[PDB]
Symmetry: C2
Subunit: 226 residues, 2 copies
């Protein structure tokens, strides 16, 4: 079981290459995750200088396999069942009244560590919009990630809207259309309609001088009573 790969603490690596309205950049992340608690600890760093977009807009893109599934619903955990071969995660993130990101990533074990390699492309973003104008507050709110089975793809789909608070007191919605596919050929677990109660907390390393992001998250599956 890919399940047995998460009984303890697992090292994590995240590599991301992006291009937003022609502005290229890269961010690396490292840390560890504990699916038993459903928690992650991660430090991200923009290795190409300043991040051309706000850090929060990248949170969802930057390993739901570290979600905590209650004992009664461990059969709905597609994420772990696809390990160690892993899965492909794709998304179309539409910022209300602004541009959109299209992401494609692979989440699989590479040795003793879980790695999330991402490629991101954004287009049609407004010059001085909330995104390119850095008008989002440096924080994050709680969201429910609704998952449904995608039998034809032998994976899953996810649909949700991220709420990014703007410094002007308004909210910038970020519609998310997710699609996950197993990498290997073996059978996986096609969960029932449920969601992931995910929370994130963004902070900074007063000692780090590079553009970065300290992220702590807690995810617990739910929606299926028992």
């Amino acid at each position: 079981k890919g399940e047995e790969l998460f009984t303890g603490v697992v090292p994590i690596l995240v590599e991301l290459d992006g291009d937003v309205n022609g502005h290229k950049f890269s961010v690396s992340g490292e840390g560890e995750g504990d699916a038993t608690y459903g928690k992650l600890t991660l430090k991200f760093i923009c290795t190409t200088g300043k991040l051309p977009v706000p850090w929060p807009t990248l949170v969802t893109t930057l390993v739901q396999c570290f979600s905590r599934y209650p004992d009664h619903m461990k059969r709905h955990d597609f994420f772990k069942s696809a390990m160690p071969e892993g899965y492909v995660q794709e998304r179309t993130i539409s910022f209300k009244d602004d541009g959109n990101y299209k992401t494609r990533a692979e989440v699989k074990f590479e040795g003793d560590t879980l790695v999330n390699r991402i490629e991101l492309k954004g287009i049609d973003f407004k010059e001085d919009g909330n995104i390119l104008g850095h008008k989002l507050e440096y924080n994050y709110n709680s969201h429910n990630v609704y998952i449904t089975a995608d039998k034809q793809k032998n994976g899953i789909k996810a649909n949700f809207k991220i709420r990014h608070n703007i410094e002007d007191g308004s909210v910038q919605l970020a519609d998310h259309y997710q699609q996950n596919t197993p990498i290997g050929d073996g059978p996986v677990l096609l969960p029932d309609n449920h969601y992931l109660s995910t929370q994130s907390a963004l902070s900074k390393d007063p000692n780090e001088k590079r553009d970065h992001m300290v992220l702590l998250e807690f995810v617990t599956a739910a929606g299926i009573t028992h």
Copy 2:
């Protein structure tokens, strides 16, 4: 100087006695805070059995002295300046279309540990409202705490509205009116209009059988340009 008491890691003790619509309960919390980073780590446990109200409703009540104040605005940090004697923190939490909370706490040092002792009274709550009916999700969102000086009372005031996500996709608002006053006779610092950008993340200790809540907080002061 009070500020000098927060340069490193500080043990935290929290004791709360509550009474909502006649239901008495108590919660004990322990952990630590590091104002250099502006983070806290606490574990609360309902010592009287099960909490009669949803845990998220008690978050704001359960030590803003642990907020991180940037170097350019360290003279606006009232909380630390009142230490070690501490300050009284009082609040009136009005849940929209439902009952309200009235809290009085003393925040001060008891040895080398910062202690927050609270007394809470809740009234006119609906037997099957979001609160007593426990319809709140177990999560929390980001909020800005706007602080203003209160020369007359020789302290500060605070106003903000907490957004409590409901299990049916709706949102329950909790209007907060805060008032802080030094406990000692010693002179404190009167801030300039600014705010505390705060984030809270709720989780559960998988090995804890008692009714409890693990909380992770990140608070950074802002609003003052420089």
